[PDB]
Write a protein that binds this ligand. Structure first.
Ligand SMILES: Nc1nc2c(ncn2[C@@H]2O[C@H](COP(=O)(O)OP(=O)(O)OP(O)(O)=S)[C@@H](O)[C@H]2O)c(=O)[nH]1
Ligand SMILES: [Mg+2]
Lengths: 305, 164
């Protein structure tokens, strides 16, 4: 009762970067409450098996995962918003570890494709809202890479006319995270190829005939969007896709983007208030700086032939 | 008597608590992370034990706010009357949350910063709060200002009443 490291558990469990802002006496109170709740949750589950308030039974992450194989309704979706937004790190880790995401993704497909109605826009949007909470957990992005048509589904979902600019952002942020996750973030030498995962999903939109050219619908979202979080995030994705180890592969990916109006798009932003933001100025510079080095290199190889 | 205070960032929860029991303001706005203190209130011919749990409005502390809910008798659902957005969030974020974690609590709907309510403006009205009180099943809707010292006692007298 002076230690007081017994809190660093609650800290990382609740995603708190700076516990130095909590008075020692308070984070003892919080520890007792953490322990108290772990015990509370236990009692509700063993009890709601008969009550039977499923609302309390789904405070078991495993139970929640299994239920989605059978239930896909507003009530459940609303409750999941509460649960995923406000639960602990480890509750999502468990959910995901037991399927969970693939189950929620399936429901999301159903929602995305459902025939128009009033309840349709909302049902789809809750999905985005719920996914936006699962994806705050790294294990979830790892799981996504291994779901056939997961990233593709996000790409399609992102092009829905039924969602909001904010929905579209959350999905993009999840795609971008995926694109950069070549290696498992918390395991030394384990390849995951999310970069290849996303690349393939963009190739699949072309070959399923949804994009007339590679990258088209993403790029066209990027182009008219007015979020500034979205312009930035879009730039980060583009640069990641172009950032390949082999010149052949950069020259190729970037050509696809040149082919659909990228260059003229950025050059217009340079004559625009957009450069006032340092996150975006640097991404645009990076693109050009990398394009130019590649020209020199190409010129340099031709010179030796 | 356990009373917990929830609502959006910056609607005036901290000020509500510290004005009720100090009774003044912290001058410097510091966003709440967690706070908990008791305080004795003279009401009727007897004193009461008020355990106050202040919570974080900010999204950053979403996974931690539930640590404040156990055994709560009353929850104060707070919005600021000059901030429709906070008002809307009561029924999309706050109520659903405490209903999920501590459905046994009575709820008082609290309209904060009344001192700032301009007219001709899209602000929230005593009518809208009273109505919401009806839909949400709160015990009461009570307007207050930490700055003009209004409704303060009223708000906390009610938390006690709905328990006796
Ligand atoms: N005019 C007026 N301003 C108020 C009133 N109450 C709080 N404020 C102001 O609004 C700001 C928010 O007050 P505060 O109580 O700290 O918000 P909060 O609800 O605790 O915000 P958070 O901790 O969840 S992030 C403060 O800077 C304060 O000056 C009020 O009754 N009238
Ligand atoms: Mg506060």
């Amino acid at each position: 009762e002076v230690v007081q490291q017994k809190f660093a558990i609650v800290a990382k469990e609740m995603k708190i970067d700076n516990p130095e802002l909590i008075t020692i006496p308070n984070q003892w109170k919080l520890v007792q409450e953490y322990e108290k709740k772990q015990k509370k949750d236990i009692r509700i589950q063993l009890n709601a098996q008969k009550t039977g308030n499923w609302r309390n039974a789904i405070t078991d992450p495993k139970y929640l995962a299994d239920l989605l194989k059978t239930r896909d309704d507003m009530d459940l979706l609303n409750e999941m918003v509460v649960v995923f937004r406000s639960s602990s790190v480890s509750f999502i880790k468990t959910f995901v570890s037991v399927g969970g995401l693939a189950n929620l993704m399936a429901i999301y497909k159903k929602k995305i494709e459902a025939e128009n109605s009033n309840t349709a826009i909302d049902e789809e949007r809750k999905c985005c809202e719920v996914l936006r909470y699962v994806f705050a957990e790294e294990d979830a992005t790892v799981a996504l890479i291994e779901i056939d048509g997961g990233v593709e589904l996000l790409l399609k979902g992102m092009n829905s006319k039924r969602i909001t600019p904010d929905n579209q952002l959350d999905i993009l942020l999840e795609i971008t995270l995926t694109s950069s996750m070549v290696e498992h973030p918390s395991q030394e030498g384990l390849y995951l190829g999310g970069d290849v995962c996303v690349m393939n999903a963009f190739s699949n939109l072309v070959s399923e005939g949804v994009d007339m050219k590679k990258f088209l619908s993403f790029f066209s979202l990027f182009s008219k969007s007015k979020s500034e979080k979205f312009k930035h995030a879009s730039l980060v994705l583009i640069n990641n896709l172009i950032d390949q180890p082999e010149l052949e592969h950069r020259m190729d990916v970037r050509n696809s983007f040149i082919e659909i109006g990228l260059v003229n798009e950025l050059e217009n932003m340079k004559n625009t208030e957009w450069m006032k933001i340092d996150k975006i100025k640097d991404s645009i510079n990076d693109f050009f700086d990398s394009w130019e080095e590649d020209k020199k290199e190409v010129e340099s190889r031709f010179d030796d032939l | 008597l356990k009373i917990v205070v929830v609502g959006d960032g910056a609607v005036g929860k901290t000020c509500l608590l510290l004005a009720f029991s100090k009774g003044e303001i912290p001058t410097a706005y510091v966003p709440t992370v967690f706070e908990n203190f008791s305080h004795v209130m003279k009401y009727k011919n007897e004193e009461f034990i008020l355990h106050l749990w202040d919570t974080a409005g900010q999204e950053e502390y979403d996974r931690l706010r539930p640590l404040s809910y156990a055994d709560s008798d009353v929850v104060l659902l707070c919005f600021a009357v000059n901030n429709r957005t906070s008002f809307d969030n009561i029924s999309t974020k706050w109520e659903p949350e405490i209903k999920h974690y501590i459905d046994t609590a009575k709820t008082v709907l609290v309209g904060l910063k009344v001192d700032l309510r301009k007219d001709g403006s899209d602000d929230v009205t005593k009518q809208e709060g009273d109505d919401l009180c009806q839909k949400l099943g709160c015990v009461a809707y009570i307007e207050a200002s930490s700055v003009a010292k209004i409704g303060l006692n009223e708000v906390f007298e009610k938390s006690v009443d709905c328990i006796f």
